[PDB]
Design a binder for this molecule. Sequence first.
Ligand SMILES: *[C@@H]1O[C@H](CO)[C@@H](O)[C@H](O)[C@H]1NC(C)=O
Ligand SMILES: *[C@@H]1O[C@H](CO)[C@@H](O)[C@H](O)[C@H]1NC(C)=O
Ligand SMILES: *[C@@H]1O[C@H](CO)[C@@H](O)[C@H](O)[C@H]1NC(C)=O
Lengths: 103, 441, 441
Amino acid sequence: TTVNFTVTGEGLEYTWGNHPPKRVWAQESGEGNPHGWPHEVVVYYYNRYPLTTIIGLCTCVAIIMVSCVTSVWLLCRTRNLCITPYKLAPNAQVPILLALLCC
Amino acid sequence: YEHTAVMPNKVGIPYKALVERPGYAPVHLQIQLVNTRIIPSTNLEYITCKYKTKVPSPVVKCCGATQCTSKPHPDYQCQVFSGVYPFMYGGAYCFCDTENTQMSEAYVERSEECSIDHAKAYKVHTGTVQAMVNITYGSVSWRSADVYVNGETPAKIGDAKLIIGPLSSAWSPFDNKVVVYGHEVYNYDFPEYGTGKAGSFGDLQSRTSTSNDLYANTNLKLQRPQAGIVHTPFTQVPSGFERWKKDKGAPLNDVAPFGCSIALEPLRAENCAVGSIPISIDIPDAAFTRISETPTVSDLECKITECTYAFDFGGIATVAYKSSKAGNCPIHSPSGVAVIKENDVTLAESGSFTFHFSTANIHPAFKLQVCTSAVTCKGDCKPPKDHIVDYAAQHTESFTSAISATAWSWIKVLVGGTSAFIVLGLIATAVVALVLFFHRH
Amino acid sequence: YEHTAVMPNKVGIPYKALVERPGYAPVHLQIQLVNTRIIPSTNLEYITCKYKTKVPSPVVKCCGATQCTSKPHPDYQCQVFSGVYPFMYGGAYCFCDTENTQMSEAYVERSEECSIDHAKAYKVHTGTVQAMVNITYGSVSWRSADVYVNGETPAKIGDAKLIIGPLSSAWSPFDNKVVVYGHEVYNYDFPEYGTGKAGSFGDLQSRTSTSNDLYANTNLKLQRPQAGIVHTPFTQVPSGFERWKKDKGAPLNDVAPFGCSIALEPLRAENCAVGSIPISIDIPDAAFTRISETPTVSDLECKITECTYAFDFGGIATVAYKSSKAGNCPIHSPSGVAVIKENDVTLAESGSFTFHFSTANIHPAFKLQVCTSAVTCKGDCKPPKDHIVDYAAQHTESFTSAISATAWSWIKVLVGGTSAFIVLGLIATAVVALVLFFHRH
Ligand SMILES: *[C@@H]1O[C@H](CO)[C@@H](O)[C@H](O)[C@H]1NC(C)=O
Ligand SMILES: *[C@@H]1O[C@H](CO)[C@@H](O)[C@H](O)[C@H]1NC(C)=O
Ligand SMILES: *[C@@H]1O[C@H](CO)[C@@H](O)[C@H](O)[C@H]1NC(C)=O
């Protein structure tokens, strides 16, 4: 029969009948390229840290979504507050600089 | 000079340090544990083994009857069977056809094998912790002695006074109750003396293997002899010691966490890699040499020529130097980034030397101490090729050990970019807020 | 028939009960503890005693000099004294005047008295609890046996099987570390082996009284011999064992709470009155008589003829009765108010009998279980006259034991009066609110 055991850096010991127990340790030789492109970096850390990478990536995306939505929401809020004083006054100066920063 | 530090509770992985006594050149210190033994206090509760049933000659009363009496024997049974007409080699034993009785007796004994084949039930309490420590320092060769890991009792090893602090973890693989059979130890909540059940582990119990007061609990029942036959038949529950030996399961020797090795003389758990060990060693004053009496090392430049973050000493570094009064100079890395294989080097007035190191870091950056001097070593390390090795890691892995410069760059952009987006939104809000004020004013 | 109950952990005070088996007349049961022993598990740490200083013959080198060497003797000292010109009975020992040398040696060893006069340092762990129990039931006389208070291990006492539950309290008078000296036990936090200080308890330490590895820490210093005299003078800190004897203080034998008595073989604490003890006893079936075969008692009238709530059986009561068969009848009081002195009484066809009881109540009221029947006894008890007695109380006092009828009268009036006055105000408050309502409506 063939038996497959998971071995970590903490080590694993196995005893085959009437033989002295043998101890083996796994090295950090997972496949990937931590110095390559983003798809290669994530693969390396996923293979080395499966759960941490999954949790880490979700946290990064969640942070980006909240920050980008908040950033754009404030910028949209800026345009509404910045332009409204001129929307209600058709006969207004409306400086050209306004059309470049608040639009 | 007393040196105090904390070393991990690891066996076979040496602890290295430089003992720096003000005014004297550093003395390299190396402390290696040969074994660590958790030796609990044990109280034998009772001894269990396979029973033997003793059956004395039955009393055959012809043309009459007899009566049973109680006796002080373990699981003693006695019964009188009337209406027997036994036959022997010489013919009918009794004259009367039915007015005859046979009184059968039986009781339980320890078998002859009980002197060698028995299980010992122990109560286990906190005991002591001992270790074998192998120590070398300076130019003194390796010396070792057995020590008590309690932080109080000193040990004299090669003119050095060693006090090994108590283990930071009070963890022990033994429960309050263990059973020792042969070389194997089992964590087993054995029944109290006098309460063992028939066909189970405690059916037969003895306070000691040579006692004369034995507890036995088997369904020993005398059966009626077969017609015309003189014998003492009985039924009994099969021995629970033989049953237990079949259903023992995995011993503590095979399931103990932290790699503990279980030994019996005395009962102890060896090499359990739990916690850390405070240490304090008093180095002889004669082992220290004054700074002005040792070589001066300067102009150090460290180059990593090869590196892989394998469990072995996969790193190779070359250090260029200039010095004076050529002679031996200890080498040490105070940080945990890299473990140095060499303990000392011989320095000329100028040249370079090489050393090997073990690191888990993908981009190691560590300080190397060269007696009275230090240099910073930096480089990149490639992944190890072997998936599985038969030896433990020399280095220690940190949270940030695996993070590459590329990964740090992406994290820096992630945090910097995320912040920059919010900052622009906040700046725009502040600018418009002021403009709204100036409109009214 | 198994009877289960909880009895107080008291020695000399009997536990009384009626074993009530459905269909059979009650069997009076009396369980009394003769002694109770807490027997902890101990491990000898080391043995301390008064030291002896061994001084070998000095080496006197004439016209020359010698050098000292290191030896394994405990607290070994060696010093070379130059410039000696010793004299003896035969004249000047050496020829040269100032070129002679004397070598002095001394070391510490156990004294001869250490074989009898020594203190044992023990580490104490939870052990076992054992007791001697005196039991009588029905018409069977008192029988006793030594038992293990585990709650599981049964004991055979006069054909009855007793199982005694563990003590409700895990309390033990022994600390984690104790010192046993003579007949005395001290809860002394002794220093670990190898860390004893000069002039203090652990200055000399030995693992056993015969050990060849002796620890000794005394400021043993060799002094220069007197001019012209051959001897080996020295100074040393007086023994810390002799000092400890002077300052050891009060032993555990004299300060243990709960009246514990301390014994050494084995080390144990006896008769500690802590908590209560669960009990389970199987009464043999032969001890029970069918109800229809026993007397029937009726028209019981109980009169308290005299009562004092003294520690002894100061209560006297008379019970009038009528009974069939004129047989013997167990007597019991299941209420905790009073303890009955007599176990059973002899009944005639009609008449009365007296019994004695001990109660703490000023106005006792208790149920007397005349076999298969019951009568309620009520009376008034006078205060005891003796201030101090040399025997323990036979009864148990409760929160309300001392509250007299007049005390209840005042409590009832004060509590009731204030409550009624509060209610009277609230009633008036509700009515006036309605009175105002009717004015508007
Ligand atoms: C063990 O792993 C190998 C992959 O090399 C696979 O082919 C095999 O089926 C596995 N065996 C079991 C029992 O999972
Ligand atoms: C101590 O270490 C040296 C070198 O590592 C070795 O030769 C010696 O056997 C060790 N001593 C023990 C008791 O293991
Ligand atoms: C049991 O009690 C009876 C009377 O109370 C006494 O005679 C007997 O000696 C007691 N047994 C023990 C062991 O003290």
